[PDB]
């Protein structure tokens, strides 16, 4: 009967409205706990991952220098990433500041609060990425047999990397360390077979130092520090064997840096590069 | 093949027809040819399907087809992933687990299914091996199987009849036809065509029956399966391929769930295809739909609960041969009951005795040791000595341990009844019989119709001869001229004769065979103590005796049968009496056990009371109906239907074994579930046709026990009452368990629909919900089977087999659209809590799953601007899945508490009264703990170790589930029939 149909529709609309209201109320009470400035926990993100710029598919960079189409995607990805690192973009003085060109201490800008509002960010110049800034060679090194990758440490809110101390010789010496305020990065062949075909790797970093300067840390998290620029480290493989697929592993070093066998990108690369003749 | 008998034919036309001779029998050259033409005199065993085929049929029964489809989809998805190198062996594990679920459920279903046992082995105690046939004018001891139609066979007292024979020459032949009528009373046989019915015509000997005494000659007329017992066994074996009502309800429930699964699968597959999804995501989502929608553990738990109740009942001497028969009692509308051996002790005992113009009643229990009916008075001692002296029956020696009433005694029914009564009331009656040295003349005959004996009293001062003569009351009265009243030998006048006739009629109106007892004190002057007596009756008087009393025998009901029949009728069950005995005894037993109530009357009784004819009176006044086999055989099915509908108390008497089956089939076509109780071979077709057949342990035949679904090992109908109660309780508890499982089904289904529609990262994995199905929800569903009744089980009427389903629309909607959605809401609250505390706010998760699951991206940005690698994202996804699983567990604890009752409240029902539910709650918690902090300490099967606060985020939602259900049941209780009991009660 019509009255029964009306009652049984009204009961269900009321019941579902009450359920939805209770659900949204619980969600809001939960959200009252968290803050817009810092995550409650960092059980997963705290040991930062190490990632590269070209954003390649199967950890493989494969191109023939004769065909521009082979490296066009890689070059375009690098251009897209570096569009925000141009000197034209970081022109303002209100948001950007001319931080020292030599590596320095981590720059605390107060604790995480809405006080002081938008923090200021150090500016990163492409000129520190020589042979790979794209200012002179728009195609970096892909036109020749000089593949260029750019290393970046995953942004972690309020994370201060502590470089490794002098307890032990971690690898073959860089001989130009400035270890108090530089986070080292080293790329080497994964196997002994790749170490004989990797060649001479030339690093490109701020101040001529081979790693991440510490004046860019900590990161304040996209709200206090929008348009933040993380430091970069260009890596170029000038002389590598043609037609061969070389396995490369790039690692960061530090007490605070950690490595996992399950997660293959936690502080390390595993990139595969081949250059067809 | 042929179903008519030839007993109107005398010797000559039978010889001409069958082509045989009485004297010469048949020539072997023709006997062998006829044997080859027709076949051996053996019963054909049925065709038993191989057990392996039955075991394999269970792999496609229930939900197994859907699970096989899911396993196939898992294999296809695994090979698609393997081609594109992105394979994780997770689909293989899912497929293997689904195959294992199918295998285990098939094993449980095979165990649950009724076992098909042949009935031929139950006829082996019958079916003789050797026959005394005559061929070529010489008698030969040839085997029974070599007989053929037309052969001339002789039978001797104490053997089995080799085939269906028509008697030609008989000498005082007695047969026991207990396999055709259920009554063991010896039946006299002759050569005379006496009755129209072949089964009662006195000149036909039946195959597999025993000849008690005498010698008879006959011609074989039926061989093998053409005999009466052949068709009885054919009906018992061939018929009975029907499903139990609980099987039908389970099948309907499976149809509902499968329809839901298929409909949602097709609809959401279309939605997935339309939203630009490739094949792998669509097939994995269909796998998830199948795994969520199927209750993987429910049917095995159903079988386990059935077996638990079966063993509980077996603890009370009630053997359940077929596991599903524990439910058929309860939801039973009609009980069709055999009389002899089932409602009756199958023991012939004295009920009433009439002396001093008074009728006294004696107790007829199987355990009675002493009875008092004013024995201190006179005229009873003389009667007791008449009982002892004029009795020939003898106990078998070495029976001191066994009680009196169970003692095996040699003699006929009346002789043994009198011996048992005397041994009970008088004590040791062998000594009294030994004392008075009886003369060797004890004449009894089938024609004389009186038992005579002359004894000399061993009183020291009397030493007088006392003669006793008992027999039929009319023959007793015509051979007497005085009566005994208070010890005085008052002459029997016209008024005394009229009172005796009235007492005889009253005793005969109760279906009791009545015996007369009288004596005479022979004078010593004419009969001194030095006189010898002759059996020729040439020296003692056979008249002018002193009448004493009238005893009657009833074959009484069992002690616990009347109150059990009353309880069964008070439970709304119609109790129909279907017996092969005569109508008078059947009606008397029906009135004694309460099948026919005292107030109610039959048409014949009303016509007799009103002094009118049966035709004149209309049939709406009589609430009872006694129908004989002759009346029922002419009835059309429509008339039988009207007879069953109109009359509530019905007694079918003198029914053939086929007529019992016809009555059962008529009852079943009334949309009713019918139970048959029996103890004989004639009940086997009816027992096998009934929805449940109940046999008697001590009083039952092997055939009846084999044909039955249930055996009363102590012969107590209280078992039937308790079975009805247990079956109704089982039905209620099955409803509760099914609702509890369907709730978890929907709670599992909702995350996948949300994942497809909104695009969130996978709230819970497909492997994870398998642990809900076969983990935390196995013991709670069993625990719900231990719930006590919320109201009076017995006051409720039997459920309609069509209009009252085990799973109706109310149950399915309340589990699907009310409680499952709430559990999904709680799980999603916990999921968003887990994600937001690590960096992903709820709105950032919408349409994130495509980039979330991309192994290319190892710098995915959260709400705070931090960057996530793929492994950290999948670890957080596993953590969210584990939190969703724990939330479902907590809300299923609440669901377990609320499903404890359907109308009552835990305050009334008792929270801690059923400890199995608390065992199951501990099982839920412990299994979740093992699956989170054990497996999960190492990341495997998408399990991780949770922070302690995630175990309590869904607790308030569980409290909300409980509060909502309590309010629903409270308002159901307050206002019955108020649109709320109709629309919210399941
Ligand atoms: C049968 C199946 C049952 C389960 C259904 C599952 C539904 C899945 C849908 C998920 C979509 C998201 C739902 C949750 C929405 C939360 C709103 C919210 O707050 O997100 C967070 C963001 C930012 O937060 P914040 O930084 O301010 O917090 C910081 C903390 N503090 C405030 C203290 C500073 O806020 C914002 O972007 C607000 C702007 C966007 C608003 C979008 C509104 C969409 C809401 C949908 C809810 C639908 C409920 C359906 C129930 C059906 C019942 C039958
Ligand atoms: C009657 C039967 C019991 C009913 C229980 C009702 C309440 C159920 C809800 C939660 C129960 C868990 C409470 C116990 C928790 C013990 C562990 C604990 O101490 O847990 C604290 C966390 C919050 O961590 P934090 O902010 O201190 O971390 C800050 C980290 N730093 C400093 C680095 C930023 O609690 C959280 O997760 C936030 C929890 C949000 C709960 C929303 C529920 C909304 C319903 C209303
Ligand atoms: C995103 C996806 C979410 C999906 C959520 C789940 C949606 C579905 C959830 C619940 C629906 C379950 C429906 C079960 C219906 C069983 C039908 C049935 O045969 O049950 C048996 C009893 C008695 O039947 P009978 O002897 O009178 O039949 C005799 C007719 N002969 C002889 C032809 C068989 O049924 C009775 O108790 C009497 C009531 C019979 C009503 C007829 C069936 C129509 C009822 C419901 C269908 C629509 C449900 C609402 C859909 C919500 C969509 C969101
Ligand atoms: C999500 C919302 C909008 C769905 C609305 C449709 C619902 C409320 C309607 C549509 C069909 C309806 C059902 C149709 C059939 C029956 C069987 C009957 O014996 C009781 C009512 C019941 C159980 C109805 C309950 C209400 C019902 C389920
Ligand atoms: C919103 C969508 C998912 C609602 C879908 C409702 C579907 C799944 C439900 C509603 C009514 C249900 C049907 C009701 C009646 C029958 C007839 C029975 O002999 C088999 C089950 C079957 C065929 C059911 C299948 C499932 C069913 C079709
Ligand atoms: C790379 O830098 C070196 C040193 O400045 C320079 O000599 C060389 O030409 C550069 N490579 C090219 C080909 O641009
Ligand atoms: F035992 Al019956 F009919 F009473 F077979
Ligand atoms: K399920
Ligand atoms: K049966
Ligand atoms: Mg019987």
What is the least distance, in Å, from the CA of B933 to any CA of chain A? Answer: 17
Contacts of B950 (CB under 8 A, 6+ apart): B830, B833, B834, B883, B886
Active site residue B555: no
> Residue B747: exposed, middle, or buried by beta-carbon count in 10 A (0-12, 13-18, 19+)?
buried
Domain boundary assignment for chain A: 1-277
Contact between residue B453 and residue B391 where contact means Cβ atoms under 8 Å apart: no
Contacts of B781 (CB under 8 A, 6+ apart): B297, B298, B301, B737, B740, B741
Locate the DSSP E strands across B251-406.
318-320, 334-337, 350-355, 358-361, 394-395
Q: No. of H helices and E strands in chain B?
A: 35, 28
Task: Tokens for B284, please give them.
Answer: 């994995």
SS3 category, B361: strand
Nearest CA among B596, B571, B572 for reference residue B583: B596
SS3 category, B224: helix
Q: Whose CA is nearest to atom 32 of ligand 1?
A: A32
Catalytic residue among B151, B338, B715, B965: B338
Helix (H) or strand (E) holding B99: helix B90-112
For residues B321 and B316, give the distance between their C-alpha atoms in angstroms, rounded to a whole number.
14
What is the least distance, in Å, from the CA of A155 to any CA of chain B? Answer: 5
For residues A235 and A152, give the distance between their C-alpha atoms in angstroms, rounded to a whole number.
11
SS3 category, B724: helix
For residues B556 and B344, give the distance between their C-alpha atoms in angstroms, rounded to a whole number.
6
B865 closest CB neighbour out of A22, A44, A222: A222
- C-alpha Rg value of chain A to the nearest Å: 24
- Convert B170-194 to b/e letters by CB count within 10 Å (16 or more is b): beebbbbbbbbbbbbbbbebebeee
For residues B815 and B79, give the distance between their C-alpha atoms in angstroms, rounded to a whole number.
37
For residues B828 and B818, give the distance between their C-alpha atoms in angstroms, rounded to a whole number.
16
What is the least distance, in Å, from the CA of B955 to any CA of chain A? Answer: 12
Compute CA distances B551 → B93, B370, B446, B515, B585, whole Å: 81, 17, 20, 6, 16
Q: What are the φ/ψ torsions at residue B353 (nearest 5 degrees)?
A: -135, 135
Map tokens 């960057």 to a residue. Answer: B867
Q: Judge: B829–A26 Cβ closer than 8 Å, yes or no.
A: yes
- In the DSSP assignment, the letter for residue A163 is P
In chain B, residues with a C-beta closer than 8 Å to the C-beta of A231 are none
Beta strand B624-628 with B649-653: parallel, antiparallel or unpaired?
parallel
Neighbours of B699 (CB within 10 A): 21
* SS (HEC) of B644-671: HHHCCEEEEECCCHHHHHHHHHHHHCCC
Interface probe for B, chosen from A45, A150, A257, A263 (most Cβ of B below 10 Å), is A45
Mutating to test ligand 1, I would choose from B841, B845, B954 the residue with most ligand atoms within 8 A of its C-beta, which is B841
Q: Judge: B867–A221 Cβ closer than 8 Å, yes or no.
A: no
Q: Judge: A260–B829 Cβ closer than 8 Å, yes or no.
A: no
In chain B, residues with a C-beta closer than 8 Å to the C-beta of A8 are 983
Task: Tokens for B651, please give them.
Answer: 């007694």
Q: Whose CA is nearest to atom 1 of ligand 6?
A: A131
Which atom of ligand 1 sits closest to the CA of residue A34? Answer: 30
DSSP notation for B621-634: S--EEEEEHHHHHT
Chain B residue set in contact with A, beta carbons under 8 Å: 817-818, 821-822, 825, 828-829, 832-833, 836-839, 841-842, 856-859, 861-862, 864-872, 875-876, 939, 953, 956-957, 960, 979, 983
In chain B, residues with a C-beta closer than 8 Å to the C-beta of A157 are 864-866
Which atom of ligand 5 sits closest to the CA of residue B256? Answer: 21
Overall residue count recorded for chain B in this entry: 986
Mutating to test ligand 7, I would choose from B184, B682, B685 the residue with most ligand atoms within 8 A of its C-beta, which is B682
Ligand 6: centre distance to CA B378 (Å): 145
Overall residue count recorded for chain A in this entry: 277
Contact between residue A200 and residue A239 where contact means Cβ atoms under 8 Å apart: yes
Q: Whose CA is nearest to atom 27 of ligand 1?
A: A36
Contact between residue B556 and residue B592 where contact means Cβ atoms under 8 Å apart: yes
Nearest CA among B390, B61, B465 for reference residue B247: B61
- Convert B907-935 to b/e letters by CB count within 10 Å (16 or more is b): eebeeeebeebeebbebbbebbeebbeee
For residues B471 and B449, give the distance between their C-alpha atoms in angstroms, rounded to a whole number.
6
- C-alpha Rg value of chain B to the nearest Å: 38
Q: Is the CB of A137 under 6 A from ligand 6?
A: yes
Nearest CA among B494, B505, B663 for reference residue B577: B663
Mutating to test ligand 7, I would choose from B185, B209, B580, B685 the residue with most ligand atoms within 8 A of its C-beta, which is B580
Contact between residue B538 and residue B694 where contact means Cβ atoms under 8 Å apart: no
For residues B644 and B334, give the distance between their C-alpha atoms in angstroms, rounded to a whole number.
10
How far, rounded to the nearest angstrom, does the alpha carbon of residue A125 sit from its chain's CA centroid? 16
How far, rounded to the nearest angstrom, does the alpha carbon of residue B382 sit from its chain's CA centroid? 49
CA atoms within 13 A on the CB side of B729: 21
Which atom of ligand 7 sits closest to the CA of residue B579? Answer: 3
Give the CATH number, domain containing residue B499: 3.40.1110.10
Locate the DSSP E strands across B795-942.
860-861, 867-868
3-state helix, strand, coil in chain B (%, to 5): 45, 15, 40
For residues B518 and B536, give the distance between their C-alpha atoms in angstroms, rounded to a whole number.
21
Nearest CA among B831, B640, B694, B86 for reference residue B335: B694
Ligand 2: centre distance to CA A190 (Å): 45
For residues B915 and B257, give the distance between their C-alpha atoms in angstroms, rounded to a whole number.
31
Neighbours of B622 (CB within 10 A): 20
Task: Tokens for B126, please give them.
Answer: 């019958």
Contact between residue B245 and residue B327 where contact means Cβ atoms under 8 Å apart: yes
Ligand 10: centre distance to CA B680 (Å): 5
Please report which residue ranges of A196-270 form alpha helices under DSSP H: none
Q: Judge: A27–B832 Cβ closer than 8 Å, yes or no.
A: yes
Q: Judge: A49–B867 Cβ closer than 8 Å, yes or no.
A: yes
Contact between residue B518 and residue B470 where contact means Cβ atoms under 8 Å apart: yes
For residues A47 and B360, give the distance between their C-alpha atoms in angstroms, rounded to a whole number.
103
> Residue A227: exposed, middle, or buried by beta-carbon count in 10 A (0-12, 13-18, 19+)?
middle
For residues B424 and B524, give the distance between their C-alpha atoms in angstroms, rounded to a whole number.
33
- Domain hosting B523: range is 350-553
A27 closest CB neighbour out of B822, B842, B872: B842
The resolution in angstroms reads: 2.8
Q: Judge: A157–B869 Cβ closer than 8 Å, yes or no.
A: no
Please report which residue ranges of B39-89 form alpha helices under DSSP H: 51-57, 64-83
């Amino acid at each position: 009967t019509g009255g029964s149909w009306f009652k049984i529709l009204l009961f269900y609309v009321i019941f579902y409205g009450c359920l939805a209201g209770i659900f949204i109320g619980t969600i809001q009470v939960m959200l009252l706990t968290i803050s817009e400035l810092k995550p409650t926990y960092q059980d997963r993100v705290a040991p930062p991952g190490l990632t590269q710029i070209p954003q390649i598919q199967k950890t493989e960079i494969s191109f023939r220098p004769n065909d521009p189409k082979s490296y066009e995607a890689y070059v375009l990805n690098i251009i897209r990433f570096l569009e925000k690192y141009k000197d034209s973009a970081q022109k303002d003085d209100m948001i950007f500041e001319d931080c020292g060109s030599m590596p320095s201490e981590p720059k605390e800008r107060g604790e995480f609060n809405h006080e002081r509002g938008e923090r200021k960010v150090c500016r990163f110049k492409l000129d520190w990425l020589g042979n790979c800034s794209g200012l002179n060679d728009e195609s970096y090194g892909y036109k020749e047999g000089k593949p260029c990758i750019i290393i970046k440490l995953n942004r972690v809110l309020g994370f201060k990397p502590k470089p490794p101390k002098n307890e032990s010789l971690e690898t073959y010496p860089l001989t130009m360390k400035y270890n108090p305020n530089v986070l080292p990065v080293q790329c080497t062949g994964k196997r002994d077979e790749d170490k004989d075909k990797v060649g001479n790797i030339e690093y490109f970093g701020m101040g001529g130092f081979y790693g991440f300067p510490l004046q860019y840390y900590p990161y304040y998290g996209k709200l206090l520090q929008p348009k933040y620029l993380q430091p970069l480290l260009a890596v170029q493989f000038t002389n590598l064997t043609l037609d061969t697929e070389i396995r490369i592993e790039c690692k960061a070093y530090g007490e605070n840096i950690g490595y996992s066998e399950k997660d293959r990108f936690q502080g390390r690369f595993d990139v595969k590069i081949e250059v067809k003749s | 093949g042929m179903d008519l008998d030839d007993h109107r034919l005398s010797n000559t036309e039978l010889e001409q027809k069958y082509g045989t001779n009485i004297i010469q029998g048949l020539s072997s050259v023709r006997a062998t040819e006829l044997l080859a033409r027709d076949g051996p005199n053996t019963l054909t065993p049925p065709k038993q399907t191989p057990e392996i085929i039955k075991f394999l049929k269970q792999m496609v029964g229930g939900f197994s087809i859907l699970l096989w489809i899911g396993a196939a989809l898992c294999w296809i998805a695994f090979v698609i992933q393997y081609v594109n190198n992105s394979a994780s062996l997770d689909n293989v594990y899912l497929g293997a687990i689904l195959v294992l679920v199918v295998i285990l459920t098939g094993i449980f279903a095979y165990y649950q299914e009724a076992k098909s046992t042949n009935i031929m082995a139950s006829f082996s105690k019958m079916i003789p091996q050797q026959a005394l046939v005559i061929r070529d004018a010489e008698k030969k001891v040839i085997s029974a199987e070599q007989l053929v139609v037309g052969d001339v066979v002789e039978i001797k007292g104490g053997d089995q009849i080799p085939a269906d024979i028509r008697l030609v020459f008989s000498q005082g032949c007695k047969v026991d036809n207990s396999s055709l009528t259920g009554e063991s009373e010896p039946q006299a046989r002759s050569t005379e065509f006496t009755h129209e019915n072949p089964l009662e015509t006195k000149n036909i000997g039946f195959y597999s029956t025993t000849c008690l005494e005498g010698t008879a000659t006959g011609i074989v007329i039926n061989t093998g399966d053409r005999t009466i017992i052949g068709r009885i066994a054919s009906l018992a074996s061939g018929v009975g391929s029907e499903k139990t009502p609980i099987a039908i309800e389970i099948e309907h429930f499976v149809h509902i769930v499968a329809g839901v699964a298929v409909s949602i699968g097709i609809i959401f597959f279309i939605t997935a295809v339309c939203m630009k999804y490739y094949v792998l995501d669509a097939i994995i989502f269909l796998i998830s739909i199948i795994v969520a929608n199927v209750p993987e553990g429910l049917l095995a738990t159903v079988t386990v609960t059935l077996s638990l109740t079966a063993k509980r009942m077996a603890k009370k001497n009630c053997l359940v041969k077929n596991l599903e028969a524990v439910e058929t009692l309860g939801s039973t509308s009609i009980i069709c009951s055999d009389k002899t051996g089932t409602l009756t002790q199958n023991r012939m005992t004295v009920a009433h005795l009439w002396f001093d113009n008074q009728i006294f009643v004696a107790d007829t229990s199987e355990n009675q040791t002493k009875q008092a009916f004013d024995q201190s008075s006179g005229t009873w001692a003389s009667l007791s000595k008449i009982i002892t002296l004029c009795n020939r029956a003898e106990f078998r020696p070495g029976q001191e341990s066994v009680p009196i009433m169970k003692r095996t005694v040699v003699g006929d029914a009346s002789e043994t009844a009198l011996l048992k009564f005397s041994e009970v009331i008088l004590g040791d009656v062998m000594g009294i019989r030994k004392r008075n040295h009886k003369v060797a003349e004890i004449p009894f005959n089938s024609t004389n119709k009186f038992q005579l004996s002359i004894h000399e009293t061993e009183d020291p001062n009397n030493k007088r001869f006392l003669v006793v003569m008992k027999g039929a009351p009319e023959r007793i009265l015509e051979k007497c001229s005085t009566i005994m009243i208070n010890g005085q030998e008052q002459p029997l006048d016209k008024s005394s004769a009229d009172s005796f006739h009235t007492a005889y009629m009253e005793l005969g109106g109760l279906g009791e065979r009545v015996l007369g007892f009288c004596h005479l004190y022979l004078p010593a002057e004419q009969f001194p103590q030095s006189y010898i007596f002759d059996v020729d009756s040439v020296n003692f008087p056979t008249s002018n005796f002193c009448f004493v009393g009238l005893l009657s025998m009833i074959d009484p009901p069992r002690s616990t049968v009347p109150d059990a029949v009353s309880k069964c009728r008070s439970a709304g069950i119609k109790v129909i009496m279907v017996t092969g005995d005569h109508p008078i005894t059947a009606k008397a037993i029906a009135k004694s056990v309460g099948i026919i109530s005292a107030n109610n009357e039959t048409v014949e009784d009303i016509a007799k009371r009103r002094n009118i004819a049966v035709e004149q009176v209309n049939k709406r006044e009589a609430k009872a109906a006694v129908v004989t086999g002759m009346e029922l055989k002419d009835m059309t099915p429509e008339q039988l239907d009207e007879l069953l509908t109109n009359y509530q108390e019905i007694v079918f008497a003198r029914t053939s074994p086929q007529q019992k089956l016809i009555i059962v089939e008529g009852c079943q076509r009334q949309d009713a579930i019918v139970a048959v109780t029996g103890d004989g071979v004639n009940d086997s077709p009816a027992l096998k046709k009934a929805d449940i057949g109940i046999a008697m342990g001590i009083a039952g035949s092997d055939a009846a026990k084999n044909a039955a679904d249930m055996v009363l090992l102590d012969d107590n109908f209280a078992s039937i009452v308790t079975g009805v109660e247990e079956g109704r309780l089982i039905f209620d508890n099955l409803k509760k368990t099914i609702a509890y499982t369907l709730t978890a089904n929907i709670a599992e289904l909702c995350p996948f629909l949300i994942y497809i529609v909104a695009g969130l990262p996978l709230p819970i994995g497909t492997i994870t919900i398998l642990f809900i199905d076969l983990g935390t929800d196995i013991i709670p569903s069993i625990a719900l089977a231990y719930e006590k009744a919320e109201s009076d089980i017995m006051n409720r009427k039997p459920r309609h087999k069509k209009k009252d389903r085990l799973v109706n629309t109310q149950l399915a909607i309340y589990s699907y659209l009310h409680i499952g959605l709430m559990q999904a809401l709680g799980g999603f609250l916990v999921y968003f809590t887990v994600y937001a505390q690590q960096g992903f706010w709820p709105t950032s998760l919408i349409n994130l799953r495509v980039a979330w699951e991309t192994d290319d991206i190892n710098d995915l940005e959260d709400s705070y601007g931090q960057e996530w690698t793929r492994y950290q994202r999948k670890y957080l996804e596993w953590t969210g899945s584990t939190a969703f699983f724990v939330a479902i567990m907590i809300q299923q604890i609440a669901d377990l508490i609320i499903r404890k009752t359907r109308r009552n409240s835990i305050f009334q029902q008792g929270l801690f009264r059923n400890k199995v539910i608390w065992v199951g709650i501990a099982s839920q918690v412990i299994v979740a703990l093992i699956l989170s902090y054990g497996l999960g300490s190492v990341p495997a099967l998408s399990f991780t170790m949770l922070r302690v606060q995630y175990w309590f985020v869904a607790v308030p939602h569980a409290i909300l589930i409980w509060v909502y259900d309590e309010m629903r049941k409270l308002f159901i209780r307050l206002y019955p029939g108020s649109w709320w009991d109709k629309n919210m009660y399941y």
